[PDB]
Symmetry: D2
Subunit: 216 residues, 4 copies
């Protein structure tokens, strides 16, 4: 597949869409603001729209390597603040996936260059959960790590000034930590769902405990 | 609601597992993406539907108004991994009409934290003030989102990642595309670059072509 | 000079200070919050305390390569937000200096590595003022660039959400753009001094015009 | 006021120009710094007075609570320029008692933007919760600022810049120091590292020594 094919594919896709339903492009402008923010991995193994059946227009999306919410990453924080304060999304979903190159590189630590600094935030998670990871078979640790990573990023998201303020003011925002295996594309709820500070803390410990009981 | 998403996913997964189990086997079999797509978080039309590309062919970054800020380590980490590790052959920066970030940069409401990110668009707006003044006021927001794409391509080409890749003769082409939400038709802004010569010549070619389109 | 000498110097400096004036360390804790934020270069050719005669405790300091205030640099923005909203500094001084390695590297563009990305923000200034720079002798351009850089960083600082909010709420905060030549250590006011949005804009154009008239 | 600073500077400059004009000539003559100092924006005692180092010997970075965040490109750019370009021989991370950033991380007032930066200290606080629980509550803030320094040294050693410099055999020593504002005496936290072995062994040595000091 070359660039000339993409431009041609696009021309055909739009022409077939305009002739069958000319209203499709009209409606989208009229369609309400997105209700969901999706924070996922740049790998985008299965697009969020196909995973969830959500329409374009219902989702606002951020993608970065290994779907991180770093405390001081102004790129992700700016997407989150615009989504929560301006679009007033009702749900934020952080979704991780199995076979993630970023997760694998964080553990294997090849000398990849610049990206290694970003991946040190995953190495932090690997260290935080070293006791839990040591209780389970070595061949399961990478799978547990991508799920632990999601739960930690939800925990970071909930602790951000954006979410603390939104929740303290009683805004309706639910944050979710989901994951899927590439072997089935089935979304699994990691049970860290939070609607306020209480459910953020309770949900975080509930999700870690459930993962611990699943692998040990 | 959230139960509907889980319901849609369950039925979608079971349907694919039953009709073509090889689909997920083919997914598990690693075939590196050849394209990096840098687009807007608005994601008005997903990149896969716009281009007809299969998900395994794309590596994606999305941020507000599809910026490539010189010092944004989130985007730079995606670009460095894509170029040096995945060895993508193409990087496409795609902008779109009716972008909330572009509109907020011009209108300047007091939105909060996001206003700092949007000051990088205000920088571009000031840069092209003379060009924008030569066209009707009602056309300026449309010109601005296209000018924004071209400036982000220019930043991408100037990054250490792209300068190093081109100096070592790696095959990487960077593109600046845009689409109107009125038709979803991709338009090449003609800033396409494969090296330092085409980066500079392409940038001025794209600005001149936009100027001739609107003036 | 080795590390063992620094530890020994420190032991002697403190002992001579404690025996002569034991109250020195007591007073500092009691001393009021700093009234000034100094944003300067990591080169720190002449320390801010010696340049201004300010005491330790009167200054809150940030230093980075070429004294930048990037719109999206959360390190500098976090220092500024804490200084303005928490310490309630009355003055913010951005100070540049001649013979700055970062400024020179931005123009000469050696392949230095990671730092080149940070320096592209200086290359942006060089491009913005290309017409002005082209009107003056080539040997003067690097000197004009470090002063233009200061004025642009003041302009960025004033446009940040932190300063816009502080000023809109009537908080007393003055921002200054200063520079000194290493040949005399004399602070020069670049005349971009701003106490509100009006003086930010008027001051910026006043400083650029004055620099233009100085070099052309 | 501001006029006093300009007045102090004028008299200081004229005084040096008259008494020793060679001072500024020696300043203009480039002699690269051998030390990078990463300290807190509080700058309670300037690094030059604490150590007796001359300004030309130091390259300085200051941020709230002297952090080395894995993905902070401001600090990473200072470190990369210092290590690869200036080829500093020593990097000193210095923390201090009574740090406003450390106190705010624990007390968690709703300060605004800065709270996000401080979550990196809250990460460290949680990491050492068991150790902190073994000492009196009134000692915990003092232990925390020292633990913070050691963790930032650990981050610095793990950065691509330091891993690359040590792998190529460059002579760079990283230090974790702290001083109490009660005496200004520099204390070596004993996490000193020159390579990957001493980084790991030094980190555990420093934590164990702090544990034995407070428990
Ligand atoms: Zn991934
Ligand atoms: Zn957009
Ligand atoms: Zn400098
Ligand atoms: Zn401090």
């Amino acid at each position: 597949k070359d660039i000339d094919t993409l431009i041609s594919n696009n021309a055909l896709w739009s022409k077939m869409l305009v002739e069958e339903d000319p209203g499709f492009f009209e409606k989208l402008a009229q369609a309400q603001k997105p209700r969901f923010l999706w924070i996922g991995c740049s790998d985008s193994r299965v697009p969020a729209e196909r995973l969830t059946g959500l329409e374009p227009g219902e989702l606002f999306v951020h993608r970065n390597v290994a779907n991180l919410v770093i405390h001081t990453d102004l790129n992700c924080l700016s997407v989150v603040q615009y989504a929560v304060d301006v679009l007033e999304v009702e749900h934020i979903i952080i979704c991780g996936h199995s076979g993630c190159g970023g997760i694998k590189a964080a553990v294997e630590n090849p000398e990849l260059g610049l990206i290694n600094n970003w991946l040190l935030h995953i190495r932090d998670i690997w260290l935080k959960h070293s006791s839990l990871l040591g209780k389970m078979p070595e061949e399961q640790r990478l799978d547990a790590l991508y799920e632990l990573n999601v739960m930690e990023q939800v925990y970071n998201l909930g602790h951000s000034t954006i979410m603390q303020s939104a929740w303290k003011r009683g805004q309706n925002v639910t944050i979710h930590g989901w994951a899927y295996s590439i072997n089935d594309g089935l979304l699994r709820d990691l049970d860290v769902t939070a609607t306020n500070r209480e459910t953020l803390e309770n949900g975080y410990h509930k999700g870690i405990s459930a993962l611990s009981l699943k692998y040990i």
